[model samples]
Target: HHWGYGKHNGPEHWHKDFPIAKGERQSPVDIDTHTAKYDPSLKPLSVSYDQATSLRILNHGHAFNVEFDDSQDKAVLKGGPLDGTYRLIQFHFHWGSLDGQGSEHTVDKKKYAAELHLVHWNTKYGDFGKAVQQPDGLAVLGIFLKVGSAKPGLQKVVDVLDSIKTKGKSADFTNFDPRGLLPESLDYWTYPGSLTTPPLLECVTWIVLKEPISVSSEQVLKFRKLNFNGEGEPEELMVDNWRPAQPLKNRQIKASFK
Candidate 1:
């Protein structure tokens, strides 16, 4: 792979192959609450998850992903800046070697212990691949994770980390409800952005919640135990799997609440 969190293939050097990496609307922006205006028109986010929709969990090198069966409208995200229903396709996380700094999208320049991205695609676009090419093709719900008491909801995922400990490893992970991982309040900052990774398509509508969920420091260590390299390759711990904050440029960050 030509991309990773390493020095040779990290975000700083991504503009070489994926020119859009330096595009106007790149993702993981620092949400400055001072400048984000309140959007009265923004509606409350609605989500319905079919635990049965989750099919598998895998370590694809860069990060761990739990993929869903999006053949129909089983798992969906609506409202909250989205015009149409978007089907959840997968979810993943980004973290650092330690808890002090990890999250991708920072709030007022403050980084959280980690961040979770719930990726959904517009059905009108036909499929995830095609959706990436359209301006309004994808919606990513970002949840910030703070290091505090252990989150019981995340324990289910922590239990399975050993199974998919290395790159290219995957295992059946069915009926997993991702809704449990979200914070109670849906108040969020919405913005237009590109995918955090290559091909770095500028197609995502990012909804980052204001509140954060709790996870113990030890729980996060499990994520770092994963390897960036696959079996037979030299071991490289999967840490700092996050893109640095991108410039907001001409984009406006809107808050659903005042």
Candidate 2:
């Protein structure tokens, strides 16, 4: 009933319902390092995540998301171009049906195997739902996933995929530290953009890591096993759930490192 990644209702057609899909600040832009400016004034990222905040994992027919409890601000993201503390709410992924093409954002026009988004809301704006409508309300830390050795931190997430195989299906998932999945280097590119999904609010301050984390080919394939349909509905594989890169327009991308 809602929007999907099919030919009829995919990213190409998103503009039909969500007018902002074609807005000036839409996300998933190609990060051409050569063109991005190096800014020495950017502060180092301050990430504080509580393992207990990880609540559950769900298959929302779009992508599998690991939800967190942001009520008390046990986990917060600060610094790195952010004006205030942003509470961690949930994390999700975007991937393709094949290994070589999945990630939404590209580097030098090269795509990765997949992409991860850690969604957070500014504490000053209150909750995520309300904050999403503001100009500077959200911060999404995007990590690129490359094919190579299997990541143990990622396996912890992949192991639960089977339990949430169908849409609306969810299971108890906790004690997992989301920080364990990040690359060693915090050097990144920051810009203003919109959500990659519908409603497509131009409220996000994107921080994309320059270094990609590793994941095995077999592990990457497991994401395809998820279904876009519920248990009784016709089976539809949940893959290629990524929006293509949008035009950068007149925005400037700043790099945290030289």
Candidate 3:
């Protein structure tokens, strides 16, 4: 059975539902920067985008339903500090209260308007969740979002959002290459991290891009116009639903260059 709770519930709330929650290391909110720092020699690996196998749209109230399947193509990095095959698992996003600031990771108190996490898994290891125990188990590509004149590149996603404005509904999108959503500059900030959710395993190697993508006001609203309520339930509107920042801990965050 799926479990749910609020701030007062504590970690134990989930332990009863899923026993693994007890042994799993939870990802704490990362708010402070690390004191210890080191420079890692690294570069972007060659990544190929294949046509998505399936696309699922969700109007979960706060975010748009622009989800797609990337199981067909593995985003690979040939040679670098990290040389491994990372499979595309899924893609999701995060946004702020307003168009000015939102995002889980912050740099010196500078919060971007939005953030998108494209999750991948290390093929060297067998399963996605299983790999979380190792340092290089997962690779997450992050891109920042800022308010600006909506680029046509965003229309493809927003168009689908318009189609699934209500909750508990889905539509299929074919011939849409998710590669179009990627930003120009692949340069990123790399750090040993963990999942942004509970049982936050520190198996993630986060690659946050330096450049921010542009989306139009209307397109942004398409996300704001979603509902999580399913059939027979009161419709719920999604608002600034983001996890608070976590601590940097003993980990070091390194940018792609220097």
Quality of model 2 by C-alpha lDDT:
0.92
**Least well predicted 10-residue stretch by lDDT in candidate 1:** 46-55
Q: TM-score for model 3?
A: 0.78
lDDT tens digits, residue span 1-258, model 2 = 569999888889889889889899999899999999999999999888753389999998899889899887788889999999899889999998888899999999999989999999998977887899899999999999999999888889998899999999999998888978989998999999999998899999999999999999889989989999999999999999999999999899999988
Q: What is the TM-score of each candidate against the true structure?
A: 0.98, 0.98, 0.78
Worst 10 residues of 2 by lDDT: 45-54
Report the C-alpha displacement of residue 38, candidate 1, in angstroms.
0.2
Q: Which regions in candidate 2 have their CA more than 4 angstroms from the true location?
A: 50-52
Could you give me the TM-score of model 2 versus the true structure? 0.98
User: How accurate locally is residue 235 in candidate 3, as Cα lDDT from 0 to 100?
Assistant: 59
Clashes of each: 1, 0, 13
Model 2 steric clash total = 0
Give the C-alpha miss distance for residue 211 in model 3, angstroms: 1.0
